[PDB]
Amino acid sequence: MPPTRDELLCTALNFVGQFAKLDVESVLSFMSPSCTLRSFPSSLGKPALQTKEESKADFQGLKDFFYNFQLRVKDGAEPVIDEPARKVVLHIEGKGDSLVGRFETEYVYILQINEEGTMVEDFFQFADSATRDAWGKKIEAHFSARN
Amino acid sequence: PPTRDELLCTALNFVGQFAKLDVESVLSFMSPSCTLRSFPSSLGKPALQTKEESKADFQGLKDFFYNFQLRVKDGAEPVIDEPARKVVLHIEGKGDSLVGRFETEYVYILQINEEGTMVEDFFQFADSATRDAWGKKIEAHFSARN
Structure with missing residues (x-):
């Protein structure tokens, strides 16, 4: 039996809730081995697509640079x-306290769940x-100053 | 209720009106109650605006672009x-603008009325x-200004 509307939302929001653990692996454990990560808007030289293996560095950075962090559905934003x-x-x-101060950003996630209803197999983010690039610049200026 | 493909046709036809750069063709496929919700907050736009308030931004679009095209990005299955x-x-979205060649992209989330014919909620992200004075991103620092 295919996942129900409720089962789909459950898996998606469990995936979203893993980011706050800042532990790298809890997010990765909700992605199937073949999961495609898609990251938009397009920018020159930046790959639109990443493998699960390629994305592990991103969750490593979340851990290293944040004291706390949480992803939450915006209030009033009903899931589609x-x-x-x-x-x-x-x-x-996304909001958290980071090495270089407060970070508050937002996204559209489009999450495709596998047939079993247990894992994300396509992870689109827009x-x-x-705010992402601004925070990225602060992280670079911070490390450049530490030297 | 409106069908899957019925909702899709109405949505894609709404997207198709933007190239006209005439302000009114887009508004005419919105409902009088239709609201426009513009994101991310970092761009400084209201999270909510009226159809009347939005006519201003469509007039901006008309004045900014000589030509403009909105398309579903290749291989992006509608949800x-x-x-x-x-x-x-x-x-x-791509077009020739006052400051030159200009390209951008969005997520649209379009809610259609029960008749399956017009847009009742227009969410865009x-x-x-950040762009330079000619609409170019930092990665394009060395490319020709077109």
Whole structure:
């Protein structure tokens, strides 16, 4: 039996809740081995697509640079669920206290769940590049100063 | 209720109106109650605005672009919540503008009315990367200005 609307939302929001653990592996453990990570908007030289293996560095950085961090569905933003496709669309806010101060960003996640309803097999994110890139610059200036 | 493909056709036709750069063709496929929700917050736009307030930004679009095209980005399957009458699309926008060649992209989430004919909620999440005076991203620092 295919996942129900409720089962799809459960797996998607369990995936989203793993980011706050800042432990690298809890997020990765909700991605199937063949999971495609897609990261938008497109930018020159940046790959749109990543393997699960390639994305582990990203979760390593979350751990290393944040005292705390949480992803949450924006209040009032009802999930959009394509039950046939096993897809959950979420308007997400990420907020945390980092090495270089407060970080508050947002995203659209589109999560495709596997047939079993247990893992994310396609992880689309559309990032708020203004805040992401600004924080990235602060991280670079911080490490450049530590030397 | 509106069908999957029925919601899809209405959504894609709404996206198709933007190239007209005439302000009114887009508004005419929105409902009088239709709201426009613009994200991310970093771009400084209201999280909520009226159809009337939005006519200003469509007039901006007309004045900014000589030509403009909105398309579903290649290979981006639409995401359709049939009971909610919502269509999620990954959109690319390209055109010749006052400051030159300009390209951007969005996620649209379009809620269609019960008749399956017009847009009742227009959610967009735009590319917020900083651009230089000619609309180019930092990675394009050395490319020709087109």
